[PDB]
Structure 1
Amino acid sequence: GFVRTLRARPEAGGKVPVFVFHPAGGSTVVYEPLLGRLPADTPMYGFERVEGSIEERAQQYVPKLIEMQGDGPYVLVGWSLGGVLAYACAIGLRRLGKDVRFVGLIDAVRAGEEIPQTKEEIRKRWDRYAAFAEKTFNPAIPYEQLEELDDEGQVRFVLDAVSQSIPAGIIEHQRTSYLDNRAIDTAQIQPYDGHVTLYMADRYHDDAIMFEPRYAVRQPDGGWGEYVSDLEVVPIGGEHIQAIDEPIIAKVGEHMSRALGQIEADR
């Protein structure tokens, strides 16, 4: 289905599982370095890609989480897009009366300024892509047809226009890559009352920034303090893309190991 078993829990008993959520344009196999930095026999389950907006995706994850974990306790972790998803499932699980005891965001850092959900920003965004496209591959943007479509329809319209004038594999990967990245842009973040740990790097890469220049700035709280009162930030340095790999993940994992040991003590 959409759940990957990174390390199975025992048939009965054992430690609380860690649930990790896939990143944008990728799979939960990227949490394997983190797993090696966690306590021995920590179970870990990865939730992979499903369709919908952020809240509609959590409408599919939450019932599976409760099948696998019941009342709790819940430990939800995600890098890149995964962080938003883990947080979204923290809010869904809290409303159902579930015990969430750790939400771990690995550099799930919001744009320094809010991204407007407007028609003018649609036009600004498609002009930005258009200019890059003539550069890296050597016309009139039909704005009225694009402003009336969602992200999925926008992308289909633009691929169909190329066909009307590319191998299937390249297309499928960039379609999910782009859509997951827009899912981060468009996320409508809801307040959460539990404890959130945010592992914060220094900066997004110059590729991400060129796609949306408002990622050139990060607030100290990563954009989350308005929505979380019990917010902890762990500075890890480096770039967004290296927060998930060795050796920086060793710093993430040492911190998370202490949080999991405390959760195991209170059981």
Structure 2
Amino acid sequence: QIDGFVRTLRARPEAGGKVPVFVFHPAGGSTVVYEPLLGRLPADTPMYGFERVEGSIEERAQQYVPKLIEMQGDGPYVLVGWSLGGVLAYACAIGLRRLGKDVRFVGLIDAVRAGEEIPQTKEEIRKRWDRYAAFAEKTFNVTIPAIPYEQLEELDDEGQVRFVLDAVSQSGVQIPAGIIEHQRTSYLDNRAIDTAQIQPYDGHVTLYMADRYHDDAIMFEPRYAVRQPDGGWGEYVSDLEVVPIGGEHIQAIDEPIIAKVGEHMSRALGQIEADRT
């Protein structure tokens, strides 16, 4: 049921049966979030979830791709993800295609680019932590002294966090390690997206598009306030289908909206199963 980074949500039969759906975790969550979707897919659809690993998006896909091949061979591959999971699913479709495997479906559940690129600069690192420090002033009713920008500016996202957590530990506050893990992993996993090196894909992608990012995403990164109609994918994906679903990014994975995703996806899986049979 949990084997390394692979969660079994519905086991495939010992032999034969329908094409599995591989789902990839969101930042801060596990693949149990795909249970509602599973309920709106056809009976006996197998489903396996890929849980977090470390590295860049490319490095994470380098860990997943071998495991995908161990599980499902030449194909067909059906890859699905919400939020960061959608970025991970796509990265896997690229890795699999370079190895000549047969990718038939890539379903992105509101995996939408920031409305403009997030600069990877020292100035942007300073601005981002100034915003974060101001929120923390308000929230924890404190004054924050001068941020040690020289220190933070040379560190990766991970380093920036551990530095900030070492400095919070330093004075006063002892945080439950479970709270720290959860906040640190959510934060780093969502930041890994900003430097994804998106490659062109030659197959069909389906983007389930909500109306907007929710407020906490915008707080994390204000460029999520704007989105383009193709969610940023059009330059990389010639064969791009968008399925508007409405609502907010945070709601897209849950009932009732997931009913709309599953209905559409069920027809795509049906077509795939007919094309083999």
- Please, what TM-score do these two structures have when normalized by structure 1? 0.99
- Cα offset, 1:67, TM superposition: 0.2
1:174 Cα shift? 0.2
Post-superposition offset of 1:118:
1.1
Question: 1: distance between equivalents of 2:198 and 2:118?
Answer: 13
Distance, in Å, in 2 between the alignment partners of 1:188 and 1:74 is 22
**1:94-145 alpha-carbon deviations (Å, 9 max, x no partner):** 0000000000000000001111111111111111101000000001111111
CA distance in 2, matches of 1:118, 1:221: 26
Q: By how many angstroms is 1:210 displaced?
A: 1.8
More displaced stretch, 135-144 vs 177-186: 177-186
Over residues 185-210 of structure 1, what are the superposed CA-to-partner deviations in whole Å (9 max), with x where a residue is unaligned? 22221111111000000011112112
CA distance in 2, matches of 1:68, 1:29: 20
The runs of 4+ residues in structure 1 deviating greater than 4 Å are none
Q: Distance in 2 between matches of 1:84 and 1:62?
A: 14
How far apart, in 2, do the equivalents of 1:167 and 1:100 lie? 43
Deviation at 1:29, TM superposition (A): 0.2
Deviations along 1:120-178, one digit per CA (max 9) or x if unpaired, are 11111111101000000001111111111111111111111112221111101000011
How much does 1:13 deviate?
A: 0.2
Stretches of structure 2 that go unaligned for 5 or more consecutive residues are none
Distance 2:218 2:197 in 1: 21
Write the deviation string for residues 36-74 of structure 1: whole angstroms up to 9, x where unpaired.
100100000000010101000000000000000000000
The number of residue pairs the alignment matches comes to 267
CA–CA separation in structure 2 for the residues paired with 1:29 and 1:207: 21
Alignment partner, residue 143 of structure 1: 149
Any idea what SS the aligned residue of 1:180 has?
A: helix
RMSD: 0.7
What is the CA–CA distance in structure 2 between the aligned matches of 1:189 and 1:108, rounded to whole Å?
13
Map of 1:25-174 to 2, 5 A cutoff?
25-138=28-141, 139-165=145-171, 166-174=175-183
> Aligned equivalents of 1:62 and 1:204: distance in 2?
29
Q: Structure 1: which 5+ residue stretches go unaligned?
A: none
Structure 2: distance between partners of 1:151 and 1:36: 36
Deviation at 1:17, TM superposition (A): 0.2
- Alpha-carbon distance in 2 for matches of 1:235, 1:34: 16
CA-to-partner distance for each residue in 1:204-256, whole Å, 9 max, x for gaps?
Answer: 11121122111111100011001110000000001111100001100000000
